[PDB]
Amino acid sequence: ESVPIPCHFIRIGDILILQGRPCQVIRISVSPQTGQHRYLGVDLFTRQLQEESSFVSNPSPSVVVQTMLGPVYKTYRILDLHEDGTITAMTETGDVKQALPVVTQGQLFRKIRDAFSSVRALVINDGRELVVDYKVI
Amino acid sequence: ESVPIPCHFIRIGDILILQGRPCQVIRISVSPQTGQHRYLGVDLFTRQLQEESSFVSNPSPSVVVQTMLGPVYKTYRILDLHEDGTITAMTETGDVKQALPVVTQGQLFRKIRDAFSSVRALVINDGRELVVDYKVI
Description:
2 copies of one chain form a homodimer.
Chain A: E1 2-6, E2 15-18, E3 21-30, E4 37-43, E5 49-53, E6 55-60, E7 63-71, E8 74-81, E9 86-90, E10 96-101, H1 108-116, E11 120-125, E12 129-135
Antiparallel strand pairs in A: 1-7, 2-3, 3-4, 4-5, 6-7, 8-9, 8-11, 9-10, 11-12
């Protein structure tokens, strides 16, 4: 449900798993005490602020890596949209999700509506699924 | 010697392995035929231009991932610098590298010289080792 990403690849606006919650990063800093990177983010569901420091590892001699956890993105085929902000989507295997919620970040629904009239929904799981991006394709 | 990175994390200026060579990315585009991402980069050793398209994978149902290969970074303790552009460094195990070359990208040697007067060198292997970044820590 998550994937480790080297910290030097992460930038403001990226989605990370902060304290077990998918969050959009709004600030990145470095700890002068440990050298860890610090990520402040906005919970995509509750809009609460969360912070988490990076995980240091030493897998091989002279190889030290700083990572954060990023969410695994699922692409669903978009079948329909509704006037309440939800969409009807279908998984790769044919499972129909009747009312998937869409984030209000960057007016995502309006862009999906403009593209619908072959759009793919990029969905994040946190049991609750959430459309956080889209791809035309 | 390499690590896969999701394409949406890669930005201009990042170092990738293009056609088996470490390259600094200078342009990113998308193929309208396949949806693959295309990366044009400058070879850090020969200064030649290389291009490579992303690798698509479908590991899990509804999970499609576009990745590129990035180099594994080694951190060496910097022991000395020389007037010819090289540095003396030591690995985590104590192996002394007497004359490690440094890239001229972003005047890296001048920044290392200013920081030396506890600096760590970030080194890339392509048998030939190359200092491509530095860290104070």
